[PDB]
Design a protein around this ligand. Structure first.
Ligand code: HEM
Ligand SMILES: O=C(N[C@@H](Cn1ccnc1)c1ccc(-c2ccc(F)cc2)cc1F)c1ccc(-c2nnc(-c3ccccc3)o2)cc1
Ligand SMILES: O=C(N[C@@H](Cn1ccnc1)c1ccc(-c2ccc(F)cc2)cc1F)c1ccc(-c2nnc(-c3ccccc3)o2)cc1
Length: 445
């Protein structure tokens, strides 16, 4: 056992907390340069080991959950949010089945319904934006996506109940993902803990009623809720109501912020590159016709440029900057032996931006995918949706959602930067959102 290089800090408990917190990507890129692909450090009492670049990241992406374990690092925070019997509250093999059920629900049939739903929700929402102005697009997209994702992933019944009170319940749930929740005992009656737990109760209740309501109807509905009510584990057991409601909460949380932040970033990338924005609008017309009829799933698959714009946005601004495991058993990578008790980390952000493999790395270039590039060229250089056992199941929905929304948005408006300001990254929020995401827009042609 030869340990990975350890980046010493004189600062007792915090370690590099402050430096890492200010700009993590720069921290990790500098470390990579000085120490190589595999290294360790301590922050706020804990020892972290990073695996940077494709070859090293392979260890995390290939590992069995018995070896590199997700619930050890996640369950404490997620279980009060998503609920019992779901996600990281059960053995991983169970979660894998639950994922299979969800995957089965995320199919082409349902996507075809989703496109119209999302186009409709989007046009209606942006009516309040009028003909022109300067508004906060991240807030717009967050508010819209909570609606679109509910409608698609929860259904019409639940969606019609989605008022501001319920939206706030969902925000209160997000609050469970706090520094306080990580650092402090659960038994402290902190406001955010109280809200989180209260909101979890009220939201489950709404889902309980909607679930029993559908079970009792003879109206055969073909949607994702139905797929869950009809699904079964290998043992044959159907999901309980509490299980289903748990999975519905997850579906929303997963469906919202990863898309909203991403969609916001794409907005500013396209605003900065007006020629690229024009080409996208022209692509709309080419594929769908000059009359611009209602979007269809099949038309989305032909929006190749828009697709590469999403792909490239994800490259430079992946919503999930980190993926972490607890090493239960010793692991070997790059000559080093990582001991049990280490938390093993990967950063899509760093891998997706690495000097050695990405040409003009900090450039937003959708066309980079028309040549040889590390997305096709390597295993794990490009990993915004992860890989292996804990890999994402929502990639196709997310693309459906983001494509439809932005397809519609390009049709409605042309977008510009304000005083040539391109938003900086707000590192203090859980998902790195854009700072001051106010965008200028005027009605399109
Ligand atoms: C742009 C949108 C999205 C991005 C960038 C994204 C990214 C990711 C990433 C990086 C992981 C790997 C987590 C890890 O290895 O620790 C993941 C896992 C997952 N995602 Fe997504 N995701 C997105 C949308 C969605 C959606 C819409 C859903 C549900 C419909 C979803 C459900 C999941 C689930 C269930 C997992 C598995 C977690 C696990 O096995 O531990 N995601 N996602
Ligand atoms: O929301 C979390 N995970 C997300 C990751 N995601 C989103 C889209 N694709 C993947 C997530 C994972 C599983 C699910 C999910 C699970 C089951 C299901 F049926 C449906 C969805 C939903 C999610 F939103 C999450 C949030 C916080 C944390 C957390 N872990 N540690 C912290 C933490 C640590 C230190 C300081 C501050 C926070 O935060 C871990 C995971
Ligand atoms: O352990 C986490 N952060 C670590 C830092 N780190 C980052 C990379 N390696 C170490 C961390 C961050 C802040 C702090 C901390 C900060 C302030 C303080 F007063 C005390 C402690 C402690 C930490 F251990 C961590 C782990 C998982 C996640 C995370 N996983 N999933 C999410 C996520 C997913 C979806 C939506 C929102 C969050 O978040 C976020 C942070």
């Amino acid at each position: 056992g030869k340990l990975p290089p350890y980046i010493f800090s004189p600062i007792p408990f915090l370690g590099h907390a402050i430096a890492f917190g200010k700009s993590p990507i720069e921290f990790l890129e500098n470390a990579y340069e000085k120490y190589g692909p595999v290294f360790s450090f301590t922050m706020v009492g804990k020892t972290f080991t990073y695996l940077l670049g494709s070859d090293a990241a392979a260890l995390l992406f290939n590992s069995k959950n018995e070896d590199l374990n997700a619930e050890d690092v996640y369950s404490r925070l997620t279980t009060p949010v998503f609920g019992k019997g779901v996600a990281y509250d059960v053995p991983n093999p169970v979660f894998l089945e639950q994922k299979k059920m969800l995957k089965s629900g995320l199919n082409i049939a349902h996507f075809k319904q989703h496109v119209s739903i999302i186009e409709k929700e989007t046009k209606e929402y942006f009516e309040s934006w009028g003909e022109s102005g300067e508004k906060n697009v991240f807030e717009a997209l967050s508010e819209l996506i909570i609606l679109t994702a509910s409608h698609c992933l929860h259904g019409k019944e639940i969606r019609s109940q989605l008022n501001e009170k319920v939206a706030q319940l969902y925000a209160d749930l997000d609050g469970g993902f706090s520094h306080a929740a990580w650092l402090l005992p659960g038994w402290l009656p902190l406001p955010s803990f109280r809200r989180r737990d209260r909101a979890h109760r009220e939201i489950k209740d709404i889902f309980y009623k909607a679930i029993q309501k559908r079970r009792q109807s003879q109206e055969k509905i073909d949607d994702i809720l139905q797929t869950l009510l009809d699904a079964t584990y290998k043992d044959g057991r159907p999901l309980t109501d509490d299980e289903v409601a748990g999975m519905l909460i997850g579906l929303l949380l997963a469906g919202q912020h990863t898309s909203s932040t991403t969609s916001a970033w794409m907005g500013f990338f396209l605003a900065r590159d007006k020629t690229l924005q024009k080409k996208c609008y022209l692509e709309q017309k080419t594929v769908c016709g000059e009359n611009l009829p209602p979007l269809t799933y099949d038309q989305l698959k032909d929006l190749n440029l828009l697709d590469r714009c999403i792909k490239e946005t994800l490259r430079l601004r992946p919503p999930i900057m980190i993926m972490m495991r607890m090493a239960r058993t010793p692991q070997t990578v790059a000559g080093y032996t990582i001991p049990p008790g280490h938390q093993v980390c990967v950063s899509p952000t760093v891998n997706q931006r690495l000097k050695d493999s990405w040409v003009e790395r900090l450039d937003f270039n959708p066309d980079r995918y028309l040549q040889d590039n590390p997305a096709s060229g390597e295993k794990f250089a490009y990993v915004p949706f992860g890989a292996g056992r804990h890999r994402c199941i929502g990639e196709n929905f997310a693309y459906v959602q983001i494509k439809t929304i932005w397809s519609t948005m390009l049709r409605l408006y042309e977008f510009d930067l304000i005083d040539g300001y391109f938003p900086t990254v707000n590192y203090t929020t859980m998902i790195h959102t854009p700072e001051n995401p106010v965008i200028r827009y005027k009605r399109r042609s």
